[PDB]
Amino acid sequence: WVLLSTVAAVVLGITTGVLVREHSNLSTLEKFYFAFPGEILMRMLKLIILPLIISSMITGVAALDSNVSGKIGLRAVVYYFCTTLIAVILGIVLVVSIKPGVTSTVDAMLDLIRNMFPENLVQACFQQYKTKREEEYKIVGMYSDGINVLGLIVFCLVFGLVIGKMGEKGQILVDFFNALSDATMKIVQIIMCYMPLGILFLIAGKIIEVEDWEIFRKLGLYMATVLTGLAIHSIVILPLIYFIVVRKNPFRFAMGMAQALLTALMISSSSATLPVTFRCAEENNQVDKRITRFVLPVGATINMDGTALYEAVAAVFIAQLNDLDLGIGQIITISITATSASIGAAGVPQAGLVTMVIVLSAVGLPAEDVTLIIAVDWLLDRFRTMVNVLGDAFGTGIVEKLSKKEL
Ligand SMILES: COCC(CCO[C@H]1CC[C@@]2(C)C(=CC[C@H]3[C@@H]4C[C@@H]5O[C@]6(CC[C@@H](C)CO6)[C@@H](C)[C@@H]5[C@@]4(C)CC[C@@H]32)C1)COC
Ligand SMILES: CC(C)CCC[C@@H](C)[C@H]1CC[C@H]2[C@@H]3CC=C4C[C@@H](O)CC[C@]4(C)[C@H]3CC[C@]12C
Ligand code: NA
Ligand code: NA
Secondary structure: OHHHHHHHHHHHHHHHHHHHHHHOOOOHHHHHHHOHHHHHHHHHHHHHHHHHHHHHHHHHHHHHHHHOOOHHHHHHHHHHHHHHHHHHHHHHHHHHHHOOOOOOHHHHHHHHHHHHOOOOOOHHHOEEEEEEEEOOOEEEEEEEEOOOHHHHHHHHHHHHHHHHHOHHHHHHHHHHHHHHHHHHHHHHHHHHHHHHHHHHHHHHHHHHHOOOOHHHHHHHHHHHHHHHHHHHHHHHHHHHHHHHHOOOOHHHHHHOOHHHHHHHHHOOOOOOOHHHHHHHHHHHOOOOHHHHHHHHHHHOOOOOHHHHHHHHHHHHHHHHHOOOOOOHHHHHHHHHHHHHHHHHOOOOHHHHHHHHHHHHHHOOOOHHHHHHHHHHHHHHHHHHHHHHHHHHHHHHHHHHHHOOOOO
């Protein structure tokens, strides 16, 4: 029903926006009140990211440690991280070149590392460190507003690793954050019940304010940029990696999971396609059952290459829409956020919209601009899963080839 309601809200939002903007003249103040129901939605989304990031990173990282207990385990995880990072890098390259939403470097790099190690954990929830060069030059820093997503992610990564390996002593902390992540995901579900009504007034608000329909062109280019990046990563990146590691032909292997890919276009939930994905791995291809039953279940929630490439493109698109040139340090900041979003937002379909707010909040971009992304998300939702299961495809073959001795 989430897809049905989101499309209805987008359709109803456009109808309301065009009719309101043509059958009534609203003041700048009256346009602000008309978007209040959607403004309330946006501050709900920002309200939940802090518990979502902390609970999901600690539970996800601690879960990964338990899941992997051998040389086979680490190779699968290493592969997953590599593909997800590559997907993000490919997306970032396209936007700067394609430039859909258009018309110091040393200090920014150090600011990145400084923000990964915040001087206060409580302030990292609502403040970020920013340096400036002044004067024959001195560097002076200040704590501007904006949640420090990098600092929270890094600490929760270190904490999750320490808590996982503490054994029975840290079990109370694992249980505490396991329940916290479960509770926070139920709150995210409650927010997604209000999302259709909030999105209705946010799409309508964007329609009313804009006097030129050229935003449709920009949004169309963004749709192409994500589609171009998703296509390249599926036929020009993922196969060669399979080629390089697995000397066999990649398109023979990729052609072998038409059933899983087709099922990924019907249910649009990689977890729901697991039964088909297993059958393809054992029946059409030759991958030992023991390797597949480890790699694929983990990849169903860790390996999300389609989503990672989509979020990275969208975040830079929003920056260009606002004409805020993305400093390179910010460009990297989107890379770790998107990669860590695989467990940083619990890797749950409900948290698909929440991640963009996290990515936008990391780089201090208007979160309200995510409405244009949500307008066409449902068009790209089916295909993002296609790459996600596709990445889980080449992992089974790659990991088995590398870890053949262990099997
Ligand atoms: C405005 O864009 C700059 C513009 C266009 C140049 O094109 C691209 C050149 C490569 C470059 C700088 C670009 C985007 C992502 C950048 C990567 C983000 C990744 O993040 C990291 C760090 C975090 C790690 C998790 C791994 O990935 C780096 C290794 C990776 C990175 C810094 C490698 C270099 C990439 C832009 C020319 O500027 C004069
Ligand atoms: C964010 C980046 C820059 C930090 C990179 C530092 C790396 C080397 C740090 C970050 C997290 C650290 C891990 C955190 C927790 C544990 C559990 C402990 O029982 C053994 C050491 C071990 C496994 C640490 C090893 C060093 C480690 C991997
Ligand atoms: Na990946
Ligand atoms: Na996947």
